[PDB]
């Protein structure tokens, strides 16, 4: 009962720590003219200890459109809003369950705010055209975490609408 | 001088590349390494959709 709920809560906070620690920094590494660091807004490297501003979008339309997609974040950005409200939702519909329903429509943004992290980790992926950042590999299990956290989720709404359905009869 | 009693030419040196190919390594070689961890990730996704 309690348990369940309590698990998912505190799934959903640590993958939204996580997706926090993934917008921060250390996202991914690369090797400059030295190896550096990057977190999506800004490079770091490894004079030495110097920081600086590296996501610059310039130097078909379709390459424009991908470019502006990777600037400024706009997937992971949106994808980090959309969990924070999933998770207000969800603190929402923890205390006061006064409609029985509001939990699917919260689970559902849940399950679109984890596939929009996915795109978001496709195109900055493919965008990246050598090593890995640690918060890449942070993001990944956060996105494993928001994915077991929905099955968690939609497995209690559809076992308390049984239950309803049960209790009507 | 007598008669030549060995005979010799200009020859090419080279470094005699040999069958250096690794295992599991070798496996993973023709798409990558990344784009694998994605497709699983998609795998997972397409799965909880389903569910």
Redesign the interface.
């Known amino acids: 009962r309690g348990v369940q709920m309590l698990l998912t809560t505190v799934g959903a906070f640590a993958a939204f720590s996580l997706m926090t620690i993934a917008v921060g920094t250390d996202y991914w590494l690369y090797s400059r003219g030295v190896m550096t660091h990057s977190g999506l807004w800004r490079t770091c490297c490894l004079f030495k200890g110097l920081c600086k501003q590296i996501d610059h979008f310039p130097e078909d339309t379709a390459e424009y459109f991908l470019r502006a997609v990777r600037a400024s974040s706009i997937f992971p950005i949106l994808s980090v809003i959309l969990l924070f409200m999933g998770g207000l939702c969800i603190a929402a519909s923890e205390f006061y369950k006064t409609r029985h329903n509001i939990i699917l429509s919260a689970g559902i943004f849940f399950v679109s705010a984890g596939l929009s992290n996915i795109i978001g980790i496709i195109v900055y992926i493919s965008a990246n055209a050598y090593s890995y950042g640690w918060s890449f590999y942070f993001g990944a299990l956060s996105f494993i975490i928001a994915e077991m956290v929905g099955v968690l989720a939609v497995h209690m709404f559809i076992d308390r609408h049984k239950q309803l359905r049960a209790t009507a009869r | 001088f007598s008669k030549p009693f060995m005979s010799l030419g200009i020859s090419i040196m080279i470094k005699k590349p040999q069958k250096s190919k690794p295992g599991v390594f070798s496996f993973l070689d023709p798409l990558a390494y ?2 694998w ?2 497709i699983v ?2 795998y ?2 397409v799965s ?2 389903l ?1």
Do not use: D, L, S, Y
């Open positions: 990344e784009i961890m994605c990730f998609a997972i996704g909880v959709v569910f």
